[PDB]
From a paper:
The CysN polypeptide also contains a C-terminal APS (adenosine-5’-phosphosulfate) kinase domain (CysC), which exists as a separate enzyme in other bacteria and plants. Alternatively, APS can be phosphorylated at the 3′-position by APS kinase (CysC) to generate 3′-phosphoadenosine 5′-phosphosulfate (PAPS), a substrate for sulfotransferases that catalyze the transfer of the sulfate group onto a variety of metabolites. Structural features typical of APS kinases of this fold family, including the P-loop required for ATP binding (residues 452–458 in CysC), the conserved LDGD motif (residues 477–480) and the lid region (residues 552–581) above the P-loop which closes upon substrate binding, are also found in CysC.
The asymmetric unit of the crystals of the CysC•ADP binary complex contains two subunits, which are related by a two-fold molecular symmetry axis. Manual inspection and analysis by the PISA server suggests a dimeric quaternary structure with a buried surface area of 3300 Å2, with the dominant part of the interface formed by interactions of residues from helices α2 and α3 with their symmetry mates. In each of the subunits the bound nucleotide was modeled in two different conformations that accounted best for the electron density map. The differences between both conformations are small; the adenine rings are slightly shifted with respect to each other due to a rotation of the glycosidic bond. The adenine ring of ADP is sandwiched between the guanidinium group of Arg559 and the side chain of Ile599. The NH2 group of adenine forms hydrogen bonds to the backbone carbonyl group of Arg597 and the side chain of Gln602. The diphosphate group is tightly anchored to the protein via the conserved P-loop at the N-terminus of helix α1 and the β phosphate interacts with main chain nitrogen atoms of residues 453–458.
Residue numbers in the entry:
A (entry chain A), B (entry chain B): 440 to 612
The structure:
């Protein structure tokens, strides 16, 4: 079967990465197109059980995710990676892993402002951060480096459904 | 798609793990079944680039391989893993990763005597070991713990084609 591709999200916690990724996966699976949401939180229980949450370990999580994505893509899947990916350097690294493998890679920026993400707070992570229960939380006490040249910028005026269709349009362009 | 399954080979260098794995992969793909050979040598260049060859790093290589295999199986592939896997603990841990995930796992022992493996010496690794250019070579220096209860035991009186079909018969059982 033909090589797949990778959509690499980036954005603040609660910006919509997983919501968009999951809906794109469903839309594609409804058409019989193999898609797969590769979420680091899932991998940390198994593949990445050796890692903690130091800065180096967060970078290594993303490095490994980039190689798992290239593997799944080479197996024919449309891979959707909803990681925060806060530093430019590790989005560049992840792209280079894909380019070295011959696999199409798209950087998709969920550009929702902090205030809006914090009002969403779907998992209560912002409430924990503000209470001092989580530190080095991207957007609060650790930096988010905004993508300068993303392939697609998703904005909060558009619905999850609309944004999902924009990702599919990108894939098909 | 229905969940896939993993075939985990084990055996000395030159016993036939890769040859059987690769032919099973071809036979299945020619029937339209989604098979994939997951080889740690390939992964060490990317995913597992951080690992060296200490005993602990060899174990961690296999631990990570077992998770990548479960992931690809959960994505619908028939996964073939041709690793030496010399310690019983390696193979038990790998099985338990699959069982915890709900994925069928088969331990296939390529039981070819050391002398016959050395007469094959397909990549010249035995010739290097005997000249003192390689060390910690399983079956010579470093122990190989023979499977006590494999799902299938492949013997060198059969052809690679015959052995491959025995693996498929196990899968279709
Ligand atoms: N485009 C959107 N329109 C409306 N609500 C959205 C939108 N994107 C996300 N949300 C809401 O915001 C929440 C946070 O989004 P989520 O996908 O969990 O973020 P992330 O995965 O980036 O942490 C979701 O629960 C969802 O209810
Ligand atoms: N059943 C067999 N009959 C004859 N030769 C075989 C058989 N199985 C393997 N071989 C030969 O031995 C070599 C085994 O190498 P390989 O499959 O790379 O072993 P491993 O992966 O176990 O190290 C192959 O080159 C192949 O030519």
């Amino acid at each position: 079967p033909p090589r797949g591709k990778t959509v690499w999200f980036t954005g603040l916690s609660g910006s919509g990465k997983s919501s968009v990724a999951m809906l794109v996966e469903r839309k594609l699976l409804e058409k019989g197109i193999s898609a797969y949401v590769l979420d680091g939180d899932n991998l940390r229980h198994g593949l990445n059980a050796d890692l903690g949450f130091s800065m180096a370990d967060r970078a290594e999580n993303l490095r490994r995710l980039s190689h798992v994505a290239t593997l799944l893509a080479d197996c024919g899947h449309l891979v959707l990676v909803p990681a925060i990916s806060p530093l430019a350097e590790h989005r560049a690294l992840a792209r280079k892993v894909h380019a070295d493998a011959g696999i199409d890679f798209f950087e998709v920026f969920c550009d929702t402002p902090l205030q809006d993400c914090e009002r969403r707070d779907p998992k209560g992570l912002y409430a924990k951060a503000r209470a001092g229960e989580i530190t080095h939380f991207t957007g609060i006490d650790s930096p988010y480096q905004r993508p300068k040249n993303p392939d697609l910028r998703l904005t909060p005026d558009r619905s999850i459904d609309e944004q999902a269709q924009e990702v599919i349009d990108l894939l098909e362009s």
